[PDB]
Amino acid sequence: PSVLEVREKGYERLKEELAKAQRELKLKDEECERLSKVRDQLGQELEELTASLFEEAHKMVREANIKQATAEKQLKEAQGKIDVLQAEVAALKTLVLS
Amino acid sequence: EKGYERLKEELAKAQRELKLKDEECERLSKVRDQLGQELEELTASLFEEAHKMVREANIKQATAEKQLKEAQGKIDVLQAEVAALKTLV
Amino acid sequence: PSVLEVREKGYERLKEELAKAQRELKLKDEECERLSKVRDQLGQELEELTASLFEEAHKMVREANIKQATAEKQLKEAQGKIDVLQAEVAALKTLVLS
Amino acid sequence: SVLEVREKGYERLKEELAKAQRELKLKDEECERLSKVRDQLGQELEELTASLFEEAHKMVREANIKQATAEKQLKEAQGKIDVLQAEVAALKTLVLS
Numbered sequence: 072p073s074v075l076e077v078r079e080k081g082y083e084r085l086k087e088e089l090a091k092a093q094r095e096l097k098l099k100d101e102e103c104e105r106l107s108k109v110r111d112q113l114g115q116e117l118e119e120l121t122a123s124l125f126e127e128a129h130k131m132v133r134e135a136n137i138k139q140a141t142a143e144k145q146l147k148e149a150q151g152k153i154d155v156l157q158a159e160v161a162a163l164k165t166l167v168l169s
Numbered sequence: 170e171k172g173y174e175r176l177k178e179e180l181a182k183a184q185r186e187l188k189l190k191d192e193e194c195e196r197l198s199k200v201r202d203q204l205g206q207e208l209e210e211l212t213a214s215l216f217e218e219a220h221k222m223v224r225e226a227n228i229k230q231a232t233a234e235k236q237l238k239e240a241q242g243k244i245d246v247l248q249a250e251v252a253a254l255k256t257l258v
Numbered sequence: 259p260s261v262l263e264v265r266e267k268g269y270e271r272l273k274e275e276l277a278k279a280q281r282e283l284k285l286k287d288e289e290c291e292r293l294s295k296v297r298d299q300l301g302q303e304l305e306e307l308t309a310s311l312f313e314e315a316h317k318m319v320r321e322a323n324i325k326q327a328t329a330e331k332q333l334k335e336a337q338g339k340i341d342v343l344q345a346e347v348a349a350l351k352t353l354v355l356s
Numbered sequence: 357s358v359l360e361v362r363e364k365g366y367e368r369l370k371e372e373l374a375k376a377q378r379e380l381k382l383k384d385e386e387c388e389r390l391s392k393v394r395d396q397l398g399q400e401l402e403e404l405t406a407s408l409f410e411e412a413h414k415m416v417r418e419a420n421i422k423q424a425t426a427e428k429q430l431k432e433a434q435g436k437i438d439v440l441q442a443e444v445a446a447l448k449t450l451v452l453s
Binding site: 121124129132149150156160164166 | 405409412413422423440441
């Protein structure tokens with residue numbers, strides 16, 4: 072009797088709730104897709120920035136090595152000049168002290 | 170250097186948000202599945218009820234038709250007796 | 259080569275493995291979407307078939323009720339005719355008795 | 357045989373739907389597995405990246421230190437050259453006096 076009417080009402084009601092859940096799930100899925108694409112773009116940008124930072128570090132190391140090598144070569148020349156000047160200094164001091 | 174840490178934190182935040190909404194989507198999917206199963210069981214019950222209604226309606230129809238046939242046979246007998254009695258008169 | 263060209267090899271190796279996992283995951287996701295659409299189409303078709311079966315059931319019930327009602331009305335007519343014929347049988351029996 | 361016909365078609369389509377459901381569930385589990393693998397690889401790449409940054413900073417600092425040392429020793433050598441040249445000028449001024 073009335074239980075059958077509650078059964079048909081429950082059938083159409085449950086069908087409508089199922090459709091509503093489908094709509095909500097589809098909408099939130101699309102939102103998840105948007106956020107996933109945003110996440111991928113941010114990841115790629117961070118990837119490029121990371122590579123750029125690594126290259127920049129290597130470049131700075133190379134430049135420091137170049138300046139170091141220049142300073143060391145100029146140091147060798149300066150040491151030879153120091154040896155010459157010290158020999159001439161010893162000669163002059165020995166000449167004065169007589 | 171500032172851009173690296175900022176962008177990194179933004180990426181981590183986007184990861185957290187995406188994970189949250191994904192888990193919510195999974196919850197809604199499970200709810201949807203439960204509703205579908207409930208509709209399946211209710212549908213089966215409704216089919217059993219429908220078969221019951223068809224069988225009962227067919228039974229009642231057969232009963233009414235049978236009683237009509239019996240009444241028609243009785244009419245035939247009574248008409249034969251009426252014809253015989255009128256032939257007697 | 260140094261740290262740059264060694265950690266570049268390892269870094270790019272792990273990076274490529276991650277890219278491979280991402281591509282495979284995307285492919286399987288797309289297949290899940292296709293199969294999900296197939297499932298939805300089959301479900302909707304099952305809904306239509308179910309509705310058709312219910313409508314057919316109600317139609318058969320209605321037709322059976324119609325035939326039953328016709329048989330009952332004709333039964334009432336038959337009962338009245340039986341009453342008339344029985345009255346005529348008793349009356350003619352009384353006439354022949356006299 | 358009405359019920360057998362409608363039951364046959366209904367159960368046929370229902371069984372096809374069940375098959376689609378099983379396939380979808382299997383592929384979903386596969387997607388979850390692949391997602392976990394992807395996450396593990398991503399975390400490993402994060403840790404490796406941090407290590408690479410620490411090592412890179414180490415290399416930059418050490419290279420700058422070595423450059424500063426060589427330049428400082430060069431400055432000391434230049435100062436010593438200036439001192440020795442002043443001593444040569446003074447001594448030659450004494451000899452020429």
